[PDB]
Symmetry: C3
Subunit: 288 residues, 3 copies
Amino acid sequence: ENGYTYEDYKNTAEWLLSHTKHRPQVAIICGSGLGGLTDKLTQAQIFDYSEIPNFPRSTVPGHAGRLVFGFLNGRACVMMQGRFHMYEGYPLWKVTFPVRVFHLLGVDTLVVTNAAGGLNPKFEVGDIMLIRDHINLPGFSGQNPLRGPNDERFGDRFPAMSDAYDRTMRQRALSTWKQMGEQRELQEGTYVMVAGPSFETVAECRVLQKLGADAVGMSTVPEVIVARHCGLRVFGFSLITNKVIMDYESLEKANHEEVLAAGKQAAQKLEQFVSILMASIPLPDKAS
Amino acid sequence: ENGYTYEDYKNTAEWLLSHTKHRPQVAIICGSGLGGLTDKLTQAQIFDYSEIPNFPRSTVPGHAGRLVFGFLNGRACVMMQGRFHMYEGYPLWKVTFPVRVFHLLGVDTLVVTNAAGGLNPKFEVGDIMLIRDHINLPGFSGQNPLRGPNDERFGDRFPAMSDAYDRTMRQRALSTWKQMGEQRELQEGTYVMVAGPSFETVAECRVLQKLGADAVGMSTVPEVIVARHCGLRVFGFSLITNKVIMDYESLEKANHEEVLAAGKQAAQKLEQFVSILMASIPLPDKAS
Amino acid sequence: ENGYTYEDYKNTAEWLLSHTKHRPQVAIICGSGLGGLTDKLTQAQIFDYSEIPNFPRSTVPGHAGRLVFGFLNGRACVMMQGRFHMYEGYPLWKVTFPVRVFHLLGVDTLVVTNAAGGLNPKFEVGDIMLIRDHINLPGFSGQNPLRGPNDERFGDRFPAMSDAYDRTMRQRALSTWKQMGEQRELQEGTYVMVAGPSFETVAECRVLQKLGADAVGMSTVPEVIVARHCGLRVFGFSLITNKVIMDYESLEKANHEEVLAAGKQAAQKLEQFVSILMASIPLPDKAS
Ligand SMILES: Nc1nc2c(ncn2[C@@H]2O[C@H](CO)C[C@H]2O)c(=O)[nH]1
Ligand SMILES: Nc1nc2c(ncn2[C@@H]2O[C@H](CO)C[C@H]2O)c(=O)[nH]1
Ligand SMILES: Nc1nc2c(ncn2[C@@H]2O[C@H](CO)C[C@H]2O)c(=O)[nH]1
C-alpha cells in the first residue's frame, strides 16, 4: 500500500533472491539492543539496507541497519537488524516495506522482537514477555499500514487481527522456556504501541495500564499487521527493559540512552531462546 | 476545509442542481450492504460520483459509488450509495465533501447508516442500533474533518457535538419501530469510529468496550461532524453485522468478506424502517 | 524537527536578538483570552509574528498573533500572545517552532497557559488548575512534535516526560496562591490534549474522565513536549472556562464563541497570579 506498488516489492524481493543463495523461511526482526542475534547465524550473508533496491535507508544512524541472511539452528533465516519506527519519520508503508519483501522471498514466519517498558507490575526489567496480543493505538487514529487501496495480491481489504500472534508458536515458546530450566517464567501479555519518540508521562502510563496493556513500545505492531495481512505466521516478544513509572513520587526517570537491559542479561538469554525456537518452527516440508 | 474551497462546493452543488430537477431535503448515506435502499426511491435520478464535478471518485471498486436523487415515502431524497472511508486513503476533507454539497443543495437532514460490529453483548448480529452518540477516536489524534482554517460560511471554528444525533428524530425512530410490531427492540448506544481497515484484536475490542462504545465502525463520524458543523439535522443507525470477539478462546474470526448480515435480514427490515421515517422528518413547510 | 532545520531556528533567534535589546529569561505562552497579560509588561517591545523571519504566521485572524518582549515583575519576559493550534492546520513542528526559538534566545523557563474545559466535577468555571501532568492523546497516534530525525543540538531522541511540569515551580505557585488570600484553592490536575476543533461529545467527555484527565484542551502539550526536550523548565496552568457536559440530559451546549470566562473573572486574577510568580522563578544568577 501507498508509495510502493506491487512491482516495487516484487523487484526488491527478486533482486534479493538473485543476490543470495539463501531462500529464507523465517524472518526475524531484531528490536532495540537485541541485534547481535545476527552474530549467531551461520553461512551469514549481510546486505546493508542501502544497497538493496527499494529498501528504506536508516536515518542518521550509520552505526547499523542491515539485512542478514543465514541459518540459525537449522532454519534458513533473514534477520533485519535495526527496524524502522514511526518516530524516525517513516510513513508506516515504509516501516513495513520489509515485511512484504519477506513474504515475496518465501518467508512464512515472522518473529518480531522489541524492547518494551513494563506497565504490568509483575514484570521485572529483564523479563521476556511473549506477545499474546496488541493494542494498536496509532491504527485507531488512522495510522495503519494497510491504509490506502488494498492489493488483493497480498491480502484482504479488511484482514482480521484477533488471531495475530500464533497460538501454536506461543504454546511452544512456553515449553521451550521450561526446557531451558529458567526459574524466571516467560511472561505473557498485551503490547501497546505508542508512536511518538518521547517517553510516557505518569498519566499516560496510567491510561495504558487501565487500557489493558502489559508492555508499551514504539514498534512491532505495524509489522505484525502487514505480516498477518499477507498470511505470515507471526510470533514475537518484548524484553521488559524498564518498569514505566506509575507514581508521581517517581524520582527515577525513563531513559533509552540506557539500552543496557537489552545488551545486559537479555543479550544472551534471549538470543539462545530464539535459536531453540527455530527447531519449533514447522518446516514447510514437515509431514509427520 | 482543506483541499476544497467554498467555490468548489458551491460549483458541485450548482452543477448538481442544474442537472436534476429534484431539490433534496433529506440526504441518506448508505453504509456497507445497506445500499439497495436506493432501489426503493421513485422518480430516481442516478449520478455516478465520477460524472459529478469535484466529487471524490470511488477507489478501485467500479461496482458502485453513485448519488441517487429521488423521492422516498413522500420526502425528496438524495442517497449516496457507497460512502468514502479513511481506510481507502481519502483525507477526511474528501470523505465528507458530499456532506457539504448536500447542505448547499438544501438538505436539512442527514441520516447516516453503517454496518458496525457489536461490543455491547446485549446486541445480536442483525440488531439495529440507533446512534445516541459517538466517540471520535481519530479526531482525538487530529483526524478531524474540520481541521484547517474554518469557513464561517459553513459554520463555527469550534462547533459543539454534545447534541449531534437529533434528540427528536431518535424519539420518533423508537416509536416508528414499535408501530411496526418488531419484537426485537431498536437498540440504542454509542458508536466508536476506528479508522484502520484491519479488524479489532481482542485487546482492542476490550479497550473499546471499556471506553464506553456499543458498536465500532470505520465511518459515519466524519460525516456527522461536518453535517452538524453546517447545521444539518443528523440521525443515523448502525446495523450490528457481527459480535466483535472479546475472548481469547475466540475460535471465530472477524470477516467483512461476509457482508451478509447487511444484505440478509437487514436488507429489508432496515430499508422499510428508513421509509416510514421519511414521514417523521419534519417538512421544511410543516406548520401545525 | 521536520520542515525547519537548526539553521532556521538559529536565524530566527538571532534576528530576534539583533532586534530587541531584551534577552528574555522566561517565555510565557498566553492561552485563549489570557492574552492581555502582555498589557502589564514594562519596556514592552512588540513584534507581530509576520515580521519575524521563519515565524509561522497566524491563520485568518488578523486580530492578534504577536511576540511581546518585556519585563514583568522583575523578570525579563517574552510573551507569545496567541498560540498556534493543531486545529488551525499547522503541523506540530510549526505549532512548537517558537518554543525552540525561545530556547535559542536564552529562555530557561516556559510557562504555558490555556483555557480548558473541566472534566473533574470539583472544578468550577473560573477555577485555575495547575498542570501537574498531561496525557498527550495525539502523540499516541504519532502526532508528536519530536517526530522525525532528532537533532542532538536541541536534545535527545527519546526525551522523558514523567518530569515535565516542574515540581518546584508547582510548589511555589501553590504557596503564592495562599499568600494572595484567595479562598478558592488553586486546583491541580492532568490536562488532556484533544486536537480536533470541534468540542467533545458526552461519550467522548466520559472516556476522557475515565482516562484520568481533569481538564481537556487543544493545546499546550506539543509546546511542553519540545520545551522539555530542549531542557526548558516548564510550568503551566489551565483556566477552567467551562464544565464539559457529562450527561445526556445536557441541555447546555459547549461554546467557545463565549471566550468570556477567560476575559471575565480570570483576566485579572490570573494575570496578577502570573506576575507574583515571576518573583518565584529562580534567577539564572540567584546563588543564596
Ligand atoms: N514508549 C516506550 N517505548 C519504550 C520503553 N522502553 C523501551 N521502549 C522502546 O525502546 C526504544 C526507546 O528506548 C523504542 C521503544 O520501542 C518505554 O518505557 N516506553
Ligand atoms: N472496525 C470494525 N468495522 C466493522 C466491524 N463490523 C463491520 N464493520 C464495518 O464494515 C466494514 C468492514 O467490513 C467497514 C466498517 O465500517 C467490526 O467488527 N469492526
Ligand atoms: N477540547 C476542548 N477545548 C476547550 C474546552 N474549553 C476550552 N477549550 C479551549 O478553548 C478553545 C476552544 O474554545 C481551544 C481549546 O484549547 C473544552 O471544553 N474542550
